[PDB]
Design an enzyme around this catalytic site. Sequence first.
Site, PDB file in Angstrom:
ATOM      1  N   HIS A 166       0.807  -1.228   0.000  1.00 45.39           N
ATOM      2  CA  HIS A 166       0.000   0.000   0.000  1.00 45.39           C
ATOM      3  C   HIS A 166       0.854   1.300   0.000  1.00 45.39           C
ATOM      4  CE1 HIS A 166       0.096   1.179   4.287  1.00 45.39           C
ATOM      5  NE2 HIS A 166      -0.199  -0.070   4.652  1.00 45.39           N
TER       6      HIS A 166
ATOM      7  N   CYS B 235       3.334   1.542   9.720  1.00 41.79           N
ATOM      8  CA  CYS B 235       3.198   0.485   8.704  1.00 41.79           C
ATOM      9  C   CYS B 235       4.554  -0.002   8.252  1.00 41.79           C
ATOM     10  CB  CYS B 235       2.371   0.968   7.519  1.00 41.79           C
ATOM     11  SG  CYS B 235       0.660   1.373   7.931  1.00 41.79           S
TER      12      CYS B 235
ATOM     13  N   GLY C 137       2.218   6.006  10.421  1.00 44.37           N
ATOM     14  CA  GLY C 137       3.643   5.932  10.099  1.00 44.37           C
ATOM     15  C   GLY C 137       4.316   4.633  10.538  1.00 44.37           C
TER      16      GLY C 137
HETATM   17  O1  LIG Z   1      -4.327   2.005   8.748  1.00 41.03           O
HETATM   18  C1  LIG Z   1      -3.386   2.683   8.333  1.00 41.03           C
HETATM   19  C2  LIG Z   1      -3.213   2.996   6.859  1.00 41.03           C
HETATM   20  C3  LIG Z   1      -4.113   2.154   5.982  1.00 41.03           C
HETATM   21  C4  LIG Z   1      -5.422   2.542   5.727  1.00 41.03           C
HETATM   22  C5  LIG Z   1      -6.296   1.698   5.058  1.00 41.03           C
HETATM   23  C6  LIG Z   1      -5.872   0.452   4.630  1.00 41.03           C
HETATM   24  C7  LIG Z   1      -4.559   0.089   4.847  1.00 41.03           C
HETATM   25 CL1  LIG Z   1      -3.991  -1.450   4.260  1.00 41.03          CL
HETATM   26  C8  LIG Z   1      -3.674   0.922   5.507  1.00 41.03           C
HETATM   27  N1  LIG Z   1      -2.412   3.171   9.130  1.00 41.03           N
HETATM   28  C9  LIG Z   1      -2.207   2.911  10.502  1.00 41.03           C
HETATM   29  C10 LIG Z   1      -1.604   1.753  10.994  1.00 41.03           C
HETATM   30  N2  LIG Z   1      -1.427   1.471  12.293  1.00 41.03           N
HETATM   31  C11 LIG Z   1      -1.871   2.357  13.177  1.00 41.03           C
HETATM   32  C12 LIG Z   1      -2.512   3.574  12.833  1.00 41.03           C
HETATM   33  C13 LIG Z   1      -2.968   4.508  13.792  1.00 41.03           C
HETATM   34  C14 LIG Z   1      -3.525   5.691  13.405  1.00 41.03           C
HETATM   35  C15 LIG Z   1      -3.664   6.012  12.050  1.00 41.03           C
HETATM   36  C16 LIG Z   1      -4.159   7.368  11.663  1.00 41.03           C
HETATM   37  O2  LIG Z   1      -4.071   7.667  10.385  1.00 41.03           O
HETATM   38  O3  LIG Z   1      -4.581   8.157  12.507  1.00 41.03           O
HETATM   39  C17 LIG Z   1      -3.270   5.105  11.092  1.00 41.03           C
HETATM   40  C18 LIG Z   1      -2.677   3.869  11.451  1.00 41.03           C
END
Ligand SMILES: O=C(Cc1cccc(Cl)c1)Nc1cncc2ccc(C(=O)O)cc12
Lengths: 303, 305
Positions: B41, B145, B143
């Site tokens: 992604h 990921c 951030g």
């Molecule tokens: O989920 C996502 C990005 C995303 C979105 C949709 C589908 C996929 Cl495969 C990936 N990011 C995040 C990951 N781990 C903790 C988060 C904590 C907070 C956030 C945030 O953007 O506030 C984001 C996080």
Amino acid sequence: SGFRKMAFPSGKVEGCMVQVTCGTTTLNGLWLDDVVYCPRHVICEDMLNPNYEDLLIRKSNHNFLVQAGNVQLRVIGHSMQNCVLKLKVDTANPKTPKYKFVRIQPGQTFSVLACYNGSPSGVYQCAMRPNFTIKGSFLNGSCGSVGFNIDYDCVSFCYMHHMELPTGVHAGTDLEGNFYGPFVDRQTAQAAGTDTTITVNVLAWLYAAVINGDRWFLNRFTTTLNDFNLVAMKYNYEPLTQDHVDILGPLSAQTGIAVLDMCASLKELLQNGMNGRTILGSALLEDEFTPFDVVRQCSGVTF
Amino acid sequence: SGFRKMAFPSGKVEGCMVQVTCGTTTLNGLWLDDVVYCPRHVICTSEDMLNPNYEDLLIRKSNHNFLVQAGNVQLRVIGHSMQNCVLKLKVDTANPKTPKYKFVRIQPGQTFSVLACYNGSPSGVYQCAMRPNFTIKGSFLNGSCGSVGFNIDYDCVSFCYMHHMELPTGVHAGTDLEGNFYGPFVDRQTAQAAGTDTTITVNVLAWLYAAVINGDRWFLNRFTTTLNDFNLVAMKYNYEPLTQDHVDILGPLSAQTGIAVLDMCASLKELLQNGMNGRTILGSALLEDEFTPFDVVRQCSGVTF
Ligand SMILES: O=C(Cc1cccc(Cl)c1)Nc1cncc2ccc(C(=O)O)cc12
Ligand SMILES: O=C(Cc1cccc(Cl)c1)Nc1cncc2ccc(C(=O)O)cc12
Ligand SMILES: [Cl-]
């Protein structure tokens, strides 16, 4: 989202761990530059009445065997500083990080890299209790394992493991050999004093729960600092000072909940319990996260 | 003595963390030998996430569109390929800090250490378990990921998880290092929700054996149970079924403490019925399920107190 007991990355400390052997005793040493630091009890019936200067004068450099991975380090000098032995070696550690020796206060937290035979086996986070003990997880051979924090690129070494008390809790020194608490390095009758809960840390953890969306414990009430301390003294909680209130200022501004308003929530939790509910997946009030740990884990500071 | 949630030392994994940038997105990569592994992604915009066609998005990219930073050094990408939900970036330099490693796919109930990273810089290490609903209860911000889950039994690092996303309940979903997701999740912004979670029974039993090893027996009783009767009671408290495999796996701890597995099951049934009555077990007022039988044997002494 999420809230875990998080330790600092241990890599900068792993590259300093060595095995120290003297006679029949094997324990862990910290190799920084050309010196290996380890508990002086490595020199040792002897633990009943140990005159460490008298036992040390009989030792020569070649009696101390120091192993760094599969390499034997050559000891070229030795001296004692309080309860720590300093072994001068012929090789400076090429993996020596930027570091300081710092003495922490009760309530402060740190990461422990538990080691056996100079090999790191695990890392965990813990706090210096108000009675100066740590609720660690250590077996025989763990002596010399160290406690640390990382501030930017600098490792601040704050603890070296020396012994276990009969209640299963642990005692040790700063890296200058001064014990935390009224403990001595010898086999005699020693016990941890009555422990108390670190109030400023419970409040920080309640702010972390609010940040993560747990608000069931909030009420409309407030309290005076004096009234809160009178109640907290009844539940074996450490007194909350104006310094603690100031330190909680940023978390109070972020959540919109005044420190004395969060104190009123804590008072109700102490007098009535959780009523079958949990806070951050816990049925007990957690005191091993400082205000700085909460801000760091809810911000993403890297090393 | 003592019992803590202990993570593996993270040094061998810290030396593999890099920052991967593609356009406006920055996340973490795992640099092993001459390949950087990261979530696919990274090639997406937030708009793309509703119904991304990764093959269509990837064919439009060239090697120089991927920026890889290891410390203060820029790595040169010389190839790229997708394997399931992971992007593999071939770089011109092999990582000199590459440890001995394997890619392993774990099962629910298994535990592992997570090295949480932001901008290719490690910030913390914690221990966690793959829940029965295939999610992890992590601590991750935007951030994170690309942060990885691992075990280090002996000198070999077994990579088992790569972080991809946060679900609406605050729990996390990700893949093994071959890009296959754990659970019925997709790297799409679609209405996905974690299934109802359950307690990892074999792990709670292991933790009760750890408490007996450390000197605590207040929760034991004079009763035993059949495996079927235990499962009928346990499923009423949202506990995972205990299989004969779990009973076999608990064999060593049963021999060390002198308490038969079905005798420890009877004590668990009683704890579920009564609660703790103001008492704790290993400093906890809840029944802990994030220590496996293997973790208990690794951390606890071989001599019962
Ligand atoms: O989920 C996502 C990005 C995303 C979105 C949709 C589908 C996929 Cl495969 C990936 N990011 C995040 C990951 N781990 C903790 C988060 C904590 C907070 C956030 C945030 O953007 O506030 C984001 C996080
Ligand atoms: O406390 C000691 C040795 C000791 C004795 C007297 C004075 C000093 Cl300064 C040191 N060692 C141990 C440390 N941490 C966990 C242990 C767990 C178990 C044991 C043990 O030998 O049973 C020992 C441990
Ligand atoms: Cl597994």
